[PDB]
């Protein structure tokens, strides 16, 4: 029980770890392509 | 030492199906007037309460669950009811009482004890004997001294009924004869009252206006000038002078003489109109809320 | 809603500036409402 | 100087240590290029 | 000395208004009309319980809670656990004895990266209606009342006949202003707006 | 992990049980404290779990069980 | 004995290849990370 | 701050207990620890 | 004088496994023999 | 399943080598707080520079009067039940056995100049009384007698303060138990004058009596004895103190409240529970017994379990 | 017979400049809203007396000393934190205390909670963690009375737009300042139910015989009985301590430390 | 290797003897005398 219980309090959502492996490249992003990013997770959240 | 512990002996002409009815009423409080280790069981019935010869009422009831030995139920076997006594200095670390009142009882309140008032008396019926077992109520500290406050106020009309608790409405009945008690009441408040006002609270008085302008400041403020009231009245009413000054100036003070006397007053009133704390439920580890009927673990006061 | 004393203090802490002081300001006086108005209000008008 | 006043004082049984449960280190992976898939299209040859 | 703009009890957007109205001399002389109501604490306890929109607008925000039947994956050995050893007390209770086991543990999560993962995928009953249930200023002990304070007493209770969300009648002098439990509930948590 | 009727959906065309008995191990693991890392526990602050072989490196059974496996 | 762990810490120790690359920019150089993690403390209770 | 520094030296030579396979990078996520 | 957190240690409890409970036994045990020895002898000294 | 306590105080108001164990001792606030105390409780109209003068004289005359003020460290701390009964002897009603107990403690103590501390604390009591700065207030019970060791114009007592009383192992002569006693002038049963009379259960209240009448202070205190609870003992009291509690109702006094009377003038007696008897029924004896030289009547309780929590109830009504 | 003693986890990340205060507020006294073994750090702190969202007075402080568990911390290591529960009776063997009080305590006296209601409380910043501590003072239950009494009373003189002492010592209530900000905000909740509680009571009694020397009275009265009630035991409190001392110092000097038995 | 110390320390403990008493003042219990001692570094020098 414990153990799952600490596993859940553990993992972020499917929904947005995704596609943050997909742009990770220099993974410092600069100013820009963090925008099209978040702009991009707002849809995948509601998607699915 | 050891728990003062006291055993109350039933007669075997009992019913029956009349000890399985009492060994529910576990952890239920009875009283005494005097205190032995060998007691008898019409001592605790309600005929041992009658005033002379007549039944109790309230305004009695409230002078005898403060002029009786308070004592709670231990273990029942049958032929044999043991029970420990609260108010008198022994130990008692195994201890446990139900909630006795259709309210709840949040942890760490204060338990006091209160008379049959929502027309609902979970007595017993004991045939053979003729007895009656008065149970009373483990009201928490709060909304007792409120029962109490509206019933004194009821009693003065009997000398010419909704409460409101946690969203719940609760409405009481009592039978308000045999006058002579309902009429001492009276003279408890007004010796409560009488000390209350120093000589200094014309100095009080001298800021009903200055209470009221600040009244129209704050949103707590105006609400403790709600509208049934002598003080916002009087604003209105009664304006205050200027007074002669300190006689003997240089020493004396006359506001801390005054609040210093009522905080007396404080303590001791809702005690004598209501009764004084015996229990007060302590947990380690069950839940909070106490719902009604269930057994809880609870410490001396 | 009726409630503007805190928020008016902490609003007059800011870089005010010169503003004009036309539609905001009231007086009087005692003669003829006509020499009142000619005069003293409407030659200064153009520099108020 | 930290003389214990009457005797035997608490704070002289303590045993609070703590402890380094292990390390981690991790090893690269060494390609050569000739092994990929891209070498066919050069044709390497050294010239000192 | 004849009165100023902002002090006015009309302002220039009125006569902006009849300036260029574009209208039909019929109802330019009603448009008028409604821009004289006034807008204080009392006069909408006039016009909206009467029909009238005072020009102004506002935008719901209700938040409610939906079940979930989550799913989980984790990765092998991502968690390293440490088990410590049981110890026993025991106190006196109810009756007689009890007693009570208790045991040490720890846990610290051996990846770089993100080990585990979560996914809500399917969905169970919605635990709140998302019902009409507006909210009530009048619970809180907030800033400055108003002067007179029948005119308080009456919004309070003009306000409470207008829905069902409301402090009990009779204000106590210090408490939390609970509102009364009703005896039944029908379609689940209810949503204030 | 998941609940019983997304097991239960799982479970028919989208994924292909593909073990249905598997082995794991049967007993736990240890930590001593003994010794080199118990005088040091002690008279410092600190303890190294490897403290014995660390000093050298410089100068179990098994059983079957039903389960459910899946690609 | 966890009773007396004040905390367990563990290390990792992680490399990242570089990449030779023409002119001009700053030559890459190889990186080393180092990490320490502390641990959290649970328990459980039952009774009887 | 930072009371877990200087307990051990940081990069402590004794031994490794296990591999890492991961190679991912890292400065993207110094979020997690020290 | 004894203290808590020692006394406990003194009281005449059950071997618990870890080597830490007995180590800080016997340093509790010889801590409380000196104290004895020295208050022993004071009276010999003292009634000089 | 006991409890004692200590304390290192004069032994001018008090000789553990004189009273015999078992005898109650009580403890007394610093005497510099009721300068303060009264400089702002005392009544209009009345200078509580009498009550100064009181306490001056008062320790002008009882020891090395130095450490007069704050500071003094090395006090007089505890004094004797039966110490504060004798300087008070001339209102307790069965006079015979009170007028032996005075003499018999002037006679017993230092010889010299107790006569001068006797009516020195008297006239103390009957100041502060006058006052407004009520005795009870600064008297509290400490505990019983148990074992002393003295020197020179210096004591250290050790006593019973919770519990039963013959748990309590002493090195005394006969045999290492005690029982508590108290001076027969003071004993006064509750239950006798209400007439109870049930065995059982008895509490054990200590009891101040006050009479304001102008210039004609009164301060008596008793040991209660009685079945009632702490709440209804008030009562009980109050009722068999009739004559007293109009005698200061009377005698201690557009428009205003100023000049109505207040609790300090209509206050006549408090009291607080100290113990308990959880016995089958209360037996005592008054036995003749001897203090040195004189004989005094006392009377030998048994069974008594100290109590607490010293809070005072005050009757006023 | 079991000591309920209580364990806190003390996080790490706190700067040593906290645990050496820590270690030194080795005798003050906390209090958890329920009594539990395994305890936190955020049930301590003041985070959990907020009431309004906001941080209370000196007169909710009143309620919460009645309403919570009072626990005496015990001994700390660089660990955790360990007390034991007192208001239960159990056998805790140690049970020392120290002086958070501008007052000598006497040997023998009883002592109650009483909220900081002058000058400021004695905090301990954790702030490396976002949450800070307060201790209720011990002072006599002789004094309660006085001060409670005394501090309300100037400020009601100082409203309308003195010293205590104990054992040979004479502590100023005033602390020499015009506090009349700050302290004239954190009690004032006090004093405003306090006039309009007794304002009414010398109207009453008017009502009801004015020759002693529709606006209901029948309910005006209960709104007087029940509020002078409810504050009349809130103020009015009893004693949770004792200090017995077996060969130490005679007295206790602020800051000073002692052993105490339970009531 | 003097060198690389960067302070190195060496502790006493001693237990002084106590008498016994007899009097109204309190008992004396036996104290236990803890200290730190430092190394102070120096060095020398000679030249050909």
Known sequence: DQLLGVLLEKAPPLSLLSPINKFQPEGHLNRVARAALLSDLKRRVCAD | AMPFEIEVLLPGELSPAETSALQKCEGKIITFSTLRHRASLVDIALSSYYINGAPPDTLSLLEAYRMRFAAVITRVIPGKLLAHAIGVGTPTPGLFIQNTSPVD????????????????????????????????????????????????????????????????????????????????????????????????????????????????????????????????????????????????????????????????????????????????????????????????????? | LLDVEATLVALRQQHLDRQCYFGVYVAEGTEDTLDVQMGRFMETWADM | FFKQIRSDDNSLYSAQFDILLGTYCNTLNFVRFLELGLSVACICTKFP | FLGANHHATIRQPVAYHVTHSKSDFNTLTYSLLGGYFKFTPISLTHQLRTGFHPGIAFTVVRQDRFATEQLLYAERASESYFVGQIQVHHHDAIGGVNFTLTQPRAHVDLGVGYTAVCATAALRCPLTDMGNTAQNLFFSRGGVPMLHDNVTESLRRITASGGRLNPTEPLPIFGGLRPATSAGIARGQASVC | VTTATLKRQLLQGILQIDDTAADVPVTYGEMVLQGTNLVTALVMGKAVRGMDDVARHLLPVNARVPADLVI | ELAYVRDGVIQFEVQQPMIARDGPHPVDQPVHNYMVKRIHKRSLSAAF | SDRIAGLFNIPAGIIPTGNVLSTIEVCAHRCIFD | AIASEALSLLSNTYVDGTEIDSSLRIRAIQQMARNLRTVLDSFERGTA | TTQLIQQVSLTDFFRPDIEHAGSIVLILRHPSDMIGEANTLTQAGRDPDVLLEGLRNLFNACTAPWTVGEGGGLRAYVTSLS????????????????????????????????????????????????????????????????????????????AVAKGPQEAARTDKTSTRRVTANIPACVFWDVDKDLHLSADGLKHVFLVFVYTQRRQREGVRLHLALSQLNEQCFGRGIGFLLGRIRAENAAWGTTGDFRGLPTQLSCMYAAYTLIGTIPSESVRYTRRMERFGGYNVPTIWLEGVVWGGTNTWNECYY
């Open chain 10, 83 to 158: 110490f504060i009964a004798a300087c008070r002897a001339e209102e307790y009603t069965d006079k015979q056995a009170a007028d032996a107990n005075r003499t018999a403690i002037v006679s017993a103590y230092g010889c010299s100049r107790m006569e001068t501390r006797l009516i020195r604390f008297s006239e103390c009591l009957r100041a502060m009384v006058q006052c407004h700065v009520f005795p009870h207030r600064f008297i509290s019970f400490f505990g019983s007698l148990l074992e002393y060791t003295i020197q020179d114009n210096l004591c250290n007592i050790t």
């Open chain 2, 105 to 301: 009882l949040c942890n760490g309140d204060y338990i006091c004890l209160l008379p049959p008032v929502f027309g609902s008396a979970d007595s017993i019926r004991l045939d053979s004997v003729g007895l009656e077992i008065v149970f009373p109520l483990t009201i928490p500290q709060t909304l007792m001294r409120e029962i109490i406050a509206k019933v004194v106020a009821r009693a003065v009309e009997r000398t010419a009924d909704v409460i409101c608790y946690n969203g719940r409405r609760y409405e009481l009945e009592t039978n308000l004869q045999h006058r002579d008690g309902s009429d001492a009441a009276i003279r408890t408040l007004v010796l409560n009252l009488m000390f209350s006002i120093n000589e200094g609270c014309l100095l009080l008085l001298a800021l009903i206006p200055t209470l009221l302008v600040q009244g129209a400041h704050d949103g707590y403020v105006n609400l403790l000038i709600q509208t049934a009231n002598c003080v916002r009245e009087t604003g209105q009413l009664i304006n205050i002078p200027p007074m002669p000054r300190i006689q003997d100036g240089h020493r004396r003070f006359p506001i801390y003489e005054t609040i210093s006397s009522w905080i007396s007053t404080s303590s001791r009133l809702g005690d004598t109109l209501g009764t004084r704390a015996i229990l007060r439920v302590c947990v380690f580890d069950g839940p909070s809320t106490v719902h009604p009927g269930d057994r809880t673990a609870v410490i001396q006061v």
